[PDB]
Amino acid sequence: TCPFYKKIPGTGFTVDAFQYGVVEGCTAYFLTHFHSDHYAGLSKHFTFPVYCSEITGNLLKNKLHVQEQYIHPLPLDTECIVNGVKVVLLDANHCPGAVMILFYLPNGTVILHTGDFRADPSMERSLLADQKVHMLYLDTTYCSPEYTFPSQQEVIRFAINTAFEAVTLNPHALVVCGTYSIGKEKVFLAIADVLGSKVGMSQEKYKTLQCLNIPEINSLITTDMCSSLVHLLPMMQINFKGLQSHLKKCGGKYNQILAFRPTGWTHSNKFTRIADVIPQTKGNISIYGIPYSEHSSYLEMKRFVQWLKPQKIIPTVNVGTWKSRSTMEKYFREWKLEAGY
Ligand SMILES: c1ccc(CN2CCC(n3cccc3)CC2)cc1
Ligand code: NI
Structure with a gap:
């Protein structure tokens, strides 16, 4: 069964959710990047629309043999409408073809899913500049100062x-x-x-x-x-x-x-x-x-989040233990108090 941190509330969209069979109420499946833990389940037999970058689409077609009729590549840095919802793909500074996804929900809420990313100051001058974000789904792989x-x-x-x-x-x-x-x-x-x-x-x-x-x-x-x-x-x-x-x-x-x-x-x-x-x-x-x-290093992640000033953060990595979850929550509160948001 598909977990909550891969669902986009108020849409028919999922992110990196191919290993749970047919997800109830999903009309469009987004794929952030071509790493196996994220694409797990995709093959020549998949018959639902997949939205992704052009590079990710080339890999789906040639390596996994996904039929071309179901591959929907989107350009980067461009407002696109999918199933009645405005979306934007941004460079994630991860592997080739990897993106972050900005969703502009019908109710006025704005959600950023980072996928996997290595945060950089140059992201402060993408289409994110001066954009309020209500929910941030964050790659927290290295969210502790030892990293x-x-x-x-x-x-x-x-x-x-x-x-x-x-x-x-x-x-x-x-x-x-x-x-x-x-x-x-x-x-x-x-x-x-x-x-x-x-x-x-x-x-x-x-x-x-x-x-x-x-x-x-x-x-x-x-x-x-x-x-x-x-x-x-x-x-x-x-x-x-x-x-x-x-x-x-x-x-x-x-x-x-x-x-x-x-x-x-x-x-x-x-x-x-x-x-x-x-x-x-x-x-x-x-x-x-x-x-x-x-x-992201801990320092790179902290800089990005303090600049973005999201209203709520949902971690997507290290969520499986009470200790890990508590540690990340304590850092998010520190960052918010230090920066004033
Ligand atoms: C996010 C939050 C917490 C963890 C758990 N690890 C933190 C860092 C520790 N550490 C000590 C020395 C070198 C690493 C090991 C436990 C992972 C990710
Ligand atoms: Ni990855």
């Missing part, structure tokens, strides 16, 4: 510099990057660019990247592994056993692997600054875990 991590730019600078130094010292080194979904493409694209290489990958992963409207993509990626010195592998293979195995398949073209494992937050962010990060090493293989987040 700190660097900017995406700082993490990419570290990765580029690390890879360039390694391959300049040893021209026979291979660089490997782990992946398990869409998102975090900048990690492998930035490394390949500094090295003058295309990124090599499986046919399945190539198909996924061909759906993302990335400019000049044919110049950047390939299924010919042997022409490339930056390879993508599934995240589960980025360990000493899996990398040793991969090194054998390249036919003595390479004599060293440098691998990156993009993670979210980890506890080492408490103690170790990104510049000070060191790898796990065994012989000619080194593995770097790098904290490349596509969710």
Whole structure:
């Protein structure tokens, strides 16, 4: 059964609600982004309208085989009417195609669903500017002050510099990057660019990247592994056993692997600054875990909410324990008292 924090009161709409069968009274199903916990249940057999971004629609058609007659892509930053209700899609700064959804209800109430997002000051100059919001459905993944991590730019600078130094010292080194979904493409694209290489990958992963409207993509990626010195592998293979195995398949073209494992937050962010990060090493293989987040830090989330000044907040993550729920509610009250709304 579909939970309350996925229902839009006063409409026939749901958000990211595909795993509950036919939802009673739902005439339009919105999808914020193409991550499996959110799309769970969608397939070629789905026969109701799905509203989403153009990139999300390309992935629905090509990867899940959803029939084209049921895919309703909407442009960003544009007032659209769906089933008699004005809606707007905004960039979420999450993975490719990810959106936040603004709903202008018939009764005059205004609701923002963030989906998954990494809050940024640039969102203060979207169509949200000077817009009253009555209800905010908030991605609270990292809603506690312990959750700190660097900017995406700082993490990419570290990765580029690390890879360039390694391959300049040893021209026979291979660089490997782990992946398990869409998102975090900048990690492998930035490394390949500094090295003058295309990124090599499986046919399945190539198909996924061909759906993302990335400019000049044919110049950047390939299924010919042997022409490339930056390879993508599934995240589960980025360990000493899996990398040793991969090194054998390249036919003595390479004599060293440098691998990156993009993670979210980890506890080492408490103690170790990104510049000070060191790898796990065994012989000619080194593995770097790098904290490349596509969710708001605590500080980023607090800034966004204090600027927006919503009347009510409904968390959508960490809602399953009394302790977690209470912790988030205490921070929302602090933020409101500090800012005066
Ligand atoms: C929102 C609100 C509360 C939680 C629970 N965690 C908070 C942070 C804790 N922590 C301590 C040291 C490193 C993390 C672990 C419990 C999650 C999300
Ligand atoms: Ni996500």
